[PDB]
Scaffold this active site. Structure first.
Site, PDB file in Angstrom:
ATOM      1  N   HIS A 256       0.823  -1.198   0.000  1.00 30.43           N
ATOM      2  CA  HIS A 256       0.000   0.000   0.000  1.00 30.43           C
ATOM      3  C   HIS A 256       0.865   1.259   0.000  1.00 30.43           C
ATOM      4  O   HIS A 256       0.607   2.191  -0.765  1.00 30.43           O
ATOM      5  CB  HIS A 256      -0.958  -0.062   1.224  1.00 30.43           C
ATOM      6  CG  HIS A 256      -1.759   1.175   1.439  1.00 30.43           C
ATOM      7  ND1 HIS A 256      -3.106   1.258   1.144  1.00 30.43           N
ATOM      8  CD2 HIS A 256      -1.402   2.384   1.930  1.00 30.43           C
ATOM      9  CE1 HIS A 256      -3.534   2.473   1.421  1.00 30.43           C
ATOM     10  NE2 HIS A 256      -2.525   3.170   1.912  1.00 30.43           N
ATOM     11  N   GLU A 257       1.914   1.301   0.821  1.00 32.09           N
ATOM     12  CA  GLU A 257       2.777   2.492   0.847  1.00 32.09           C
ATOM     13  C   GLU A 257       3.491   2.657  -0.487  1.00 32.09           C
ATOM     14  O   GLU A 257       3.651   3.766  -0.975  1.00 32.09           O
ATOM     15  CB  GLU A 257       3.806   2.438   1.981  1.00 32.09           C
ATOM     16  CG  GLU A 257       3.185   2.535   3.374  1.00 32.09           C
ATOM     17  CD  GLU A 257       2.171   3.688   3.520  1.00 32.09           C
ATOM     18  OE1 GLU A 257       2.409   4.805   3.012  1.00 32.09           O
ATOM     19  OE2 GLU A 257       1.133   3.486   4.171  1.00 32.09           O
TER      20      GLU A 257
ATOM     21  N   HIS B 111       1.489   4.506  -3.037  1.00 31.02           N
ATOM     22  CA  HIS B 111       1.790   5.942  -2.870  1.00 31.02           C
ATOM     23  C   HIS B 111       3.133   6.371  -3.430  1.00 31.02           C
ATOM     24  O   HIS B 111       3.207   7.374  -4.132  1.00 31.02           O
ATOM     25  CB  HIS B 111       1.754   6.375  -1.387  1.00 31.02           C
ATOM     26  CG  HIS B 111       0.402   6.275  -0.756  1.00 31.02           C
ATOM     27  ND1 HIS B 111      -0.748   6.679  -1.397  1.00 31.02           N
ATOM     28  CD2 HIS B 111       0.017   5.828   0.462  1.00 31.02           C
ATOM     29  CE1 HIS B 111      -1.784   6.484  -0.601  1.00 31.02           C
ATOM     30  NE2 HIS B 111      -1.348   5.950   0.525  1.00 31.02           N
TER      31      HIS B 111
ATOM     32  N   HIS C  91      -5.381   7.357  -2.357  1.00 28.13           N
ATOM     33  CA  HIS C  91      -6.386   6.409  -1.882  1.00 28.13           C
ATOM     34  C   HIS C  91      -7.569   6.198  -2.856  1.00 28.13           C
ATOM     35  O   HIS C  91      -7.973   7.102  -3.590  1.00 28.13           O
ATOM     36  CB  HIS C  91      -6.904   6.828  -0.499  1.00 28.13           C
ATOM     37  CG  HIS C  91      -5.870   6.732   0.572  1.00 28.13           C
ATOM     38  ND1 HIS C  91      -5.675   7.721   1.506  1.00 28.13           N
ATOM     39  CD2 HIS C  91      -4.950   5.777   0.835  1.00 28.13           C
ATOM     40  CE1 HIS C  91      -4.685   7.377   2.309  1.00 28.13           C
ATOM     41  NE2 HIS C  91      -4.217   6.206   1.913  1.00 28.13           N
TER      42      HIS C  91
END
Ligand SMILES: COc1cccc(CNC(=O)c2nc3ccc(F)c(OCCc4ccc(C(=O)O)cc4)c3c(=O)[nH]2)c1
Ligand SMILES: [Ca+2]
Ligand SMILES: [Ca+2]
Ligand code: NA
Ligand SMILES: [Zn+2]
Ligand SMILES: [Zn+2]
Length: 170
Positions: A119-120, A123, A129
């Site tokens: 998930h990071e 980014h 998101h």
């Protein structure tokens, strides 16, 4: 002449990362395996290549820290904020910071380092998101108890909008 890109993305396919330091929670090897698997989530569906550096300056500097750790985003102790990453760009761009007041695991206990890292790294690569509650990039960490990780189609569409699909077979 050159105008700036429409979206924050890396202007190169070959990215480097460095694990600057390590959490107490897991072995070096567990941490390396978790980050390697998390990068493979993204490289498997784009033309992106990730090379780990042992030292020096990488595109994606990864570290574990607590409270004030050198940016405008201090961590907050146990629970709450887990990690954050900066969108593509110079310096702090792409870097991923993990709150070492959390318990990082390779299981469903605590916070799964692979899952939060994947998930990071979304980014770090240009994804914000998603509203899709099933998405990797959904803002709220849940651990589904899925044995097998599968990148949801929302995140595939998102990352491929930035970098294209790479090889659509292996
Ligand atoms: C800091 O904010 C955040 C940080 C992270 C996530 C989020 C938001 N997204 C989610 O919570 C989420 N997305 C998923 C998407 C696809 C999946 F397949 C999923 O299940 C995979 C399970 C699994 C876990 C670990 C291993 C291993 O160790 O190999 C294998 C399988 C999930 C899932 O469980 N959760 C927010
Ligand atoms: Ca960087
Ligand atoms: Ca925290
Ligand atoms: Na910890
Ligand atoms: Zn930080
Ligand atoms: Zn996020």
């Amino acid at each position: 002449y050159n105008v700036f890109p429409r979206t924050l993305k890396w202007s190169k396919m070959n990215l480097t990362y460095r694990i600057v330091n390590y959490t107490p929670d897991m072995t070096h090897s567990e941490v390396e395996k978790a980050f390697k698997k998390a990068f493979k989530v993204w490289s498997d569906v784009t033309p992106l290549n990730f090379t780990r550096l042992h030292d020096g300056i990488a595109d994606i500097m990864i570290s574990f820290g607590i409270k004030e750790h050198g940016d405008f985003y201090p961590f907050d102790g146990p629970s709450g904020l887990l990690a954050h990453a900066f969108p593509p760009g110079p310096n702090y761009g792409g870097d991923a910071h993990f709150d070492d007041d959390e318990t990082w695991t390779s299981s469903s206990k605590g916070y799964n380092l692979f899952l939060v890292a994947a998930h990071e790294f979304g980014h770090s690569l240009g994804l914000d998101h998603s509203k899709d509650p099933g998405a990797l990039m959904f803002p709220i960490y849940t651990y589904t108890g899925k044995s097998h990780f599968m990148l949801p189609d929302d995140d595939v569409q998102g990352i491929q909008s930035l970098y294209g699909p790479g090889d659509e077979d292996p």
